Design an enzyme around this catalytic site. Sequence first.
Site, PDB file in Angstrom:
ATOM      1  N   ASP B 215      47.031  70.775  45.846  1.00 31.70           N
ATOM      2  CA  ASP B 215      47.689  71.180  47.078  1.00 31.70           C
ATOM      3  C   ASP B 215      47.253  70.133  48.128  1.00 31.70           C
ATOM      4  O   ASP B 215      46.134  70.188  48.638  1.00 31.70           O
ATOM      5  CB  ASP B 215      47.242  72.602  47.456  1.00 31.70           C
ATOM      6  N   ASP B 342      58.788  85.025  52.530  1.00 29.65           N
ATOM      7  CA  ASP B 342      57.536  84.300  52.374  1.00 29.65           C
ATOM      8  C   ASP B 342      56.360  85.295  52.507  1.00 29.65           C
ATOM      9  O   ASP B 342      56.607  86.492  52.570  1.00 29.65           O
ATOM     10  CB  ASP B 342      57.497  83.070  53.303  1.00 29.65           C
ATOM     11  N   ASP B 455      53.989  80.301  44.282  1.00 26.95           N
ATOM     12  CA  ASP B 455      53.448  79.228  45.114  1.00 26.95           C
ATOM     13  C   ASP B 455      51.936  79.175  44.893  1.00 26.95           C
ATOM     14  O   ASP B 455      51.384  80.101  44.306  1.00 26.95           O
ATOM     15  CB  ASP B 455      53.741  79.529  46.593  1.00 26.95           C
ATOM     16  N   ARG B 515      55.662  75.875  42.287  1.00 28.07           N
ATOM     17  CA  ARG B 515      55.189  74.656  42.915  1.00 28.07           C
ATOM     18  C   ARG B 515      54.508  73.734  41.898  1.00 28.07           C
ATOM     19  O   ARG B 515      54.810  72.547  41.871  1.00 28.07           O
ATOM     20  CB  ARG B 515      54.255  74.947  44.081  1.00 28.07           C
ATOM     21  N   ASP B 531      55.363  70.693  50.346  1.00 29.77           N
ATOM     22  CA  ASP B 531      55.371  70.604  51.800  1.00 29.77           C
ATOM     23  C   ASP B 531      55.679  69.215  52.292  1.00 29.77           C
ATOM     24  O   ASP B 531      54.789  68.422  52.578  1.00 29.77           O
ATOM     25  CB  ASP B 531      54.032  71.126  52.348  1.00 29.77           C
TER      26      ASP B 531
END
Lengths: 88, 857
Positions: B215, B342, B455, B515, B531
Amino acid sequence: FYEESKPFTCLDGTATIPFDQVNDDYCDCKDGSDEPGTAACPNGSFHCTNTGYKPLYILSSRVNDGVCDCCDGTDEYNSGTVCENTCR
Amino acid sequence: VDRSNFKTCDESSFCKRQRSIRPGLSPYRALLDTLQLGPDALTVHLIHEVTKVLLVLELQGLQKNMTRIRIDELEPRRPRYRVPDVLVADPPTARLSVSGRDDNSVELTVAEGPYKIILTAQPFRLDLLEDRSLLLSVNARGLMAFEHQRAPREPGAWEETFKTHSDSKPYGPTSVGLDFSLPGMEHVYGIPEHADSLRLKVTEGGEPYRLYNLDVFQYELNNPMALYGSVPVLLAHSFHRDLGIFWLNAAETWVDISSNTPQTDIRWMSESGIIDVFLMLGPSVFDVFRQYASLTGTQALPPLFSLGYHQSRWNYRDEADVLEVDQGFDDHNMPCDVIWLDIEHADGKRYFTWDPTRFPQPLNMLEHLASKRRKLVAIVDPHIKVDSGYRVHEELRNHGLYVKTRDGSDYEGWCWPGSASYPDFTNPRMRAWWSNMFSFDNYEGSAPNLYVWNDMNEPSVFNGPEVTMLKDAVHYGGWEHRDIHNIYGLYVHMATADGLIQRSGGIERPFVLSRAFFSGSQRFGAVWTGDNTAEWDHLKISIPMCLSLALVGLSFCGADVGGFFKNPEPELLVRWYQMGAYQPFFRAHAHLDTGRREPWLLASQYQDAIRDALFQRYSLLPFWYTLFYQAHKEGFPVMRPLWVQYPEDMSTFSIEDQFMLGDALLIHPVSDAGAHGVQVYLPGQEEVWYDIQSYQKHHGPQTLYLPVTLSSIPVFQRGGTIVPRWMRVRRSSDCMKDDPITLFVALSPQGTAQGELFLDDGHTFNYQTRHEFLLRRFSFSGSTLVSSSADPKGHLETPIWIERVVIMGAGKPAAVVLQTKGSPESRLSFQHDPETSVLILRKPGVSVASDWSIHLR
Ligand SMILES: *[C@@H]1O[C@H](CO)[C@@H](O[C@@H]2O[C@H](CO)[C@@H](O)[C@H](O)[C@H]2NC(C)=O)[C@H](O)[C@H]1NC(C)=O
Ligand SMILES: O[C@H]1[C@H](O)[C@@H](O)CN2CC[C@H](O)[C@H]12
Ligand SMILES: [Ca+2]
Ligand SMILES: [Ca+2]
């Protein structure tokens, strides 16, 4: 001997078509005037008669889309969705 | 990005040890007296001349022009990791026969030829040939390195620290590495995920490419830092051949690429596990796609709605907000299939729950979306709040299904719900538990129109090293986190997809966005590039990023439309809608601190351009669906680099500002502020291209400067193709999925064209369990358009009919005749534009399930 009926002329004058091309589910007029009752024209409009209450116009693309758009449910006549009258 | 939070190669002790070895004479040698040859494999002992460590080489010829190389210790202190659940089957083998032999070499023939493998004993080397053509060599630079397992307990080999995070490293140095030489190759691709160019760069004067699911906050462009996913597959292309290398290792992996008559050398370096590599010898790129698909499977067929437009942000406030957004699409005549929820939708980031103020009646909200024929997606992450009142936590704690630390306690780190534990998704019982949590009885408030988003599944750990799990955490079977890292996310994705299948009784196709990913993730749904930022260069990088993914089997890729971080100016948001509208996964998404950007909030000129882009996408849904069916059946990418379609055109090998969808559409989205034109390269000697808006024809090969406005999306249909469209754009794909088709026939200079069309119910496994589908082939030659079955096994009861045919590159006929079994011959009316040579055939009226022919007289 026998007098024939006159053909349909689009409200914008773009074409003259037989009346079997009116609501025949194919768009023949650039203004959508041959298909008020179907989803065939991208710029047509369907009239919600809404008998007893205020009438409304919706996009042609919302005729038989499976969604209840008119309070009288007349937009859904051959989609599988049975709409209830909610005009009251 | 804060680079001090992520290790460079010098800071990863195993990368530093491996990369310090330079080219030279390998200390490894094969002991030919130990050679054994069976019908499935050749095995031979290898020895390190200094340390005397013994290894075992298992060499195999495989069906479909592949070779498998596996190297492991002969007598290890403990077993080395071998990657599970990625390979879909035990690959069928091909017999190796000794066709040559001397005191330092053995020549092996694969089956009855033409492929051969030369094993050199001293120094250990493997050469792979087709007849007399050298395809590749293994250990040609002598960079093979197999750190044997030492007695459990120089700098960083054992206990190691990064920032304040300590890796106890109980098994010490165990890294493995090996080099490959590719004579004739100057262009290599793949090994996602990196925010970098499609054609990979040489790494000689900088960092190797890194594969370690991480991440990376505010990631930057054109660099080799590891991002959220890892697919250890590298493709090599030349005018003459295509090759692929699939390095089956789940541990942290570094890849060096160097150039040198032209030749590219590749070196792979992994923290642990065995050396397990597949060499995919092509010869065409399509042969490489099939080869790789036979090993790791194909793209899961998306339910149709998931190929529509997705509207998201962090976060929609509550039910009223979701319903206002839904109503906003309809009031502004803009189609949308799904609205996303979300992390703020849950009760304090307890997944599988609902905030009781914001979402008190999720079933009622889902019923309202169902009445609009729309879906919802809810985020579910693989970190569970440490809370005794949270049923999910108590069950996982009680059943010991969390990842553990070395002392045996459940690992607890910091994430969105504060203190959180990490389910061990490598454990099959944990995945079974997770899948069952998606039953409608367990996940209260869920319904069949609720789909899922996974995610933070790297896994992301806020207080962990590099924002991830400790290397020495312990998983199922006693494996360390270092052994399994890169498949953790894939297991989360797999178990969620299975949950959505199971809750429906095995009938409904899943939709899951993930992700993190690995080889084989294509089998479970979609991925996105994380992102990104609301900047022009991040709009541009969406093409090479999704192309790098397409090449390695992940066809269902996208990037956040508008950029995740920051506020895009309206022009950038329009251009992003246009780009996204021609990319596989099409979702608008935005960070918590951003202004609202639902498309009707912009000035009318911008709304109109966005609506146009949405209409283009929706009308192409039958084409997108067919490409996805082809990906599902063959393993062929949906989104393609131009070199895949023009392999001998060397000017296409690095192109990344343009791409193709199947063999039929060439897309050059506008990607600069204030652009009034674009430079489009239209390839192909004897090929023609039709601008889909103007119908203007252009002959290849040429670079054309095309004028553009705000509403322009430079799209060209290739001569020789037939593209099916739903011209009646309605509010969602469910509304359109029974509607009539318009066929767009783009004639080649020879006056021919072909194209396929896949149709089914749009969402179940009935196409496979009941053969309830249609696969049609449309073909044009001479003066006749024909519809025939491309797969007679498929039948489908459907009202879908052919309402129109648009023919580009045709003259004016005198008559148009339709023939179909069961009807009298029909005469169709037509319209013809002499300036563009565009012929419109009015209302054929024939069922898409029927064979028919249209003759132009
Ligand atoms: C396996 O490799 C063979 C050898 O390259 C392939 O066969 C060749 O295919 C090319 C077209 O790409 C032809 O030009 C050659 O004439 C073929 N050679 C021979 C010896 O048949 C074959 O297609 C590959 N098979 C698979 C399943 O990938
Ligand atoms: O919006 C998502 C984003 O798409 C992810 O890449 C990271 N997530 C972190 C928290 C929130 O869920 C956010
Ligand atoms: Ca009509
Ligand atoms: Ca309706």
